Design a protein around this ligand. Structure first.
Ligand SMILES: Nc1ncnc2c1ncn2[C@@H]1O[C@H](COP(=O)(O)OP(=O)(O)S)[C@@H](O)[C@H]1O
Ligand SMILES: Nc1ncnc2c1ncn2[C@@H]1O[C@H](COP(=O)(O)OP(=O)(O)S)[C@@H](O)[C@H]1O
Ligand SMILES: Nc1ncnc2c1ncn2[C@@H]1O[C@H](COP(=O)(O)OP(=O)(O)S)[C@@H](O)[C@H]1O
Ligand SMILES: Nc1ncnc2c1ncn2[C@@H]1O[C@H](COP(=O)(O)OP(=O)(O)S)[C@@H](O)[C@H]1O
Lengths: 242, 242, 242, 242
């Protein structure tokens, strides 16, 4: 039924409880956009979904695989979840092409040639096939972020997580990244995107999750939550940032 | 998380097992369209959601109310779920106005004045204000189905069930009913619609459920399931519709 | 002057030269019927006149506007040319009415009321006023093709292109479509029609263009070209529709 | 009559309508400054003039060339319009000289000697003739922006666009760049400058365009618009600036 099933997820960092009982259902092929004030645990939530973070209480089931089960291979689960961070996504001492074939070649044992062809295909999809042999330090922010997306997709994941991938870029470079993300959404990839770009949220998001202080205060279709919020805290957040 | 939660639902008629274990998650505000071969249990399924049919196995929770809770709770489920049939939704020997107010007054103990006011606003919603005092025998099939909707809505339900609502209608009379259902969808009503109007599904439906022989064989976004069906039984059914 | 002026038009799809020097003059109000063997470039020619294809060599002037001039707005020219394809002409997720008012409201900025009123006039003209609120999937081939025509005319174009609009229809629904086309011809609309229905060409065509292998082998009034063709290739082709 | 002619321009990202109908007339030789609240669409507007962004409605004509004209023709627009961004204008891994000659040689097919002669002439223009063989990492931010201008100018554009050209600079380095831009203005260049440097605007601008939420709320001579604004939105923004 769901590609991502989260039940009463709780997470603390010592004395500080960040996630206070998150409940989420995301269907395969759905694009879920997460918004909310800072410190609400948006990034922490993504990190949990990417297995970069252990969790205290709750249950997380990815593609029918409970992360707490005996027979669960967490590295295998980590193979089906791709993630793009706000900033440093590439190894600097590696070329674009090699950054992309590294995991597929190691993890999925693809021969160097099967990996590189797939990488050239993803580079073309993001419009940077000509940068295959360049190093990250020579890319613009917008180009590096697109390559970061190609790299994550090279593992052919079932889910793609995005933690404010454009929040850092200058306005000129924002579109080229969102454009790739939109293209990716039209392809049926299950996506979870933390972002402040409400235009992208409305246009390509299937559902929006309003996270505030460790809780999902409201949930709903973009149109319904942005223009018909049902909770004052939601209207509050939406008004102040407008 | 879900207005309608269905788990491993099974329904048999002694020997005949109509529902072979279906699972469904419908969120508040979603419009779900159900399509599939005859004898697949689509209608029986709806009648289980409305407590019109009892089930042998599985679990059903509507708006947080389990369908196996005390009757007193089941009554609120009954009141909160509205349903429109192929035909026969109105009492033929009763005016349009009286058909609409009957249940609110009798069940919700609403007073005459409040019930009629609501009924009149609803007649405006479906475009049949001037038909308030007419009898069903004086309405076209298209106007009768619209009155059926206003009647189901008079109870202020949180969910609206439609079982092939326009199927008994001439093609010329289908649009006006679909138009009203679309308006209801835009207002955020949780809807479960069993229909053959595929165009309507593409425009108004959030998800489509393909049922075949008592099983939910495929589920997905209308465009995805319609244009790029993944399972063979789905493809087979669509090759007869498209 | 000349509603359509094409000089030495050449078109290639890679190393495949499809049109190799097309020359055509079509004055306003003329109904030009294009015939010829398969793969002659008939559809390609129409695609070019509708700006769906960029051409390699030659000139194309639509109502005095050269498509290669620096001050030419190619989009404004596309607004002037309506097209009806052999098959998929309507958005499946929209009603008949909404299919027709989409471009007029979006492109010509007509308020909903002015667009819908004009859409109803056209629906009536094509005899489908009672289908305004129906969806494409509920239409027969014949009805859908007539709505496709109604839709194209909604933009009030100066030219109407038809790529074998009845070739796909059963012989039962061919009539209603040609009928609308005949009525459109009687109204003075400049038309270009690719068709195999030679009965329509003789009756409504002001001129017939015999295309073969990317060249216009012969041109002339229907009677003259069908009854007394001058080129043996023209006679060869006509004797075979026999 | 206008080097830049913009009519009812609209640009949207889903429901987000960034530009809501902009009309702009800029004559050859005028210097137009654009000011306004963040999110008004100032940068998006400039990106439309340089064919970096595509638009939904209305039309743009640059130097008699329409932006919806054939490509081979749009390339001439791209060549005639230069632009300086707030930060990333140069390739950090190549020298000042090579940065300036790159496009001229690659795009305009200018030979090396001609390209370098022009680059040297332009370096004298911006006052960095001794920086020809330096790398961007050895230039102050102010020197780098002056090189960005020389670089944009090497293509001999008819129009120069500036998107907050000095905004990322220390107040101490803002003057040297404004000085170059002032010189460029005295030379008769058509310029569009999105900037917060009001003093510069009063001296160098022929007109000012105040943008607010996708609209050009007010326009006029710098002194008139700044010192005696007519509209409330204009007054409101200015109370935050002066
Ligand atoms: N590793 C670690 N160790 C200790 N504390 C952490 C850690 N990571 C986050 N935090 C804190 O958790 C809160 C949510 O961070 P989050 O970034 O998830 O909030 P948003 O993404 O909503 S801004 C915020 O105070 C972060 O400072
Ligand atoms: N009361 C009763 N008693 C015995 N059998 C019944 C009964 N009611 C239904 N059936 C049968 O259930 C199947 C699904 O009906 P359903 O109408 O749910 O299929 P669809 O809605 O998909 S056409 C089909 O064979 C119906 O003949
Ligand atoms: N997009 C594209 N890409 C590659 N090739 C194409 C394309 N479109 C057409 N062709 C070919 O051009 C020829 C004429 O097609 P045309 O349909 O114009 O011939 P008729 O209309 O006379 S049957 C025939 O081989 C078509 O296969
Ligand atoms: N690619 C993309 N996708 C979605 N939304 C976008 C995109 N690009 C811009 N926008 C938005 O356009 C608005 C104006 O940006 P503009 O930078 O033109 O405002 P100013 O220059 O006035 S600060 C603002 O909300 C920007 O967030």
């Amino acid at each position: 039924l769901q590609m991502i099933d989260v039940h009463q997820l709780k997470k603390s960092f010592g004395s500080l409880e960040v996630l206070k009982g998150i409940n989420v259902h995301i269907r395969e092929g759905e694009v879920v956009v997460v918004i909310g004030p800072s410190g609400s645990g948006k990034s922490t939530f993504l990190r949990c979904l990417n297995l970069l973070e252990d969790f205290d209480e709750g249950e997380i089931i990815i593609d029918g695989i409970n992360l707490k089960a005996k027979d669960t291979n967490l590295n295998k689960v980590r193979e089906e979840v791709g993630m793009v961070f706000q900033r440093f996504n590439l190894f600097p001492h590696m070329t674009v092409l090699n950054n992309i074939t590294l995991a597929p070649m190691k993890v999925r044992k693809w021969p160097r040639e099967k990996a590189e062809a797939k990488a050239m295909e993803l580079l073309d999809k993001v419009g940077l096939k000509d940068k295959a042999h360049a190093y990250p330090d020579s890319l613009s922010g917008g180009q590096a972020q697109r390559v970061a997306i190609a790299r994550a997709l090279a593992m052919e994941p079932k889910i793609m997580l995005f933690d404010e991938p454009t929040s850092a870029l200058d306005p000129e470079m924002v579109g080229e990244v969102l454009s790739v993300m939109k293209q990716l959404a039209n392809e049926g990839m299950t996506m979870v995107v933390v972002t402040h770009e409400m235009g992208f949220a409305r246009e390509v998001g299937d559902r929006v999750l309003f996270m505030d202080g460790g809780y999902i205060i409201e949930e709903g279709k973009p149109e319904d939550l942005f223009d018909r919020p049902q909770h004052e805290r939601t209207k509050a957040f939406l008004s102040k940032v407008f």
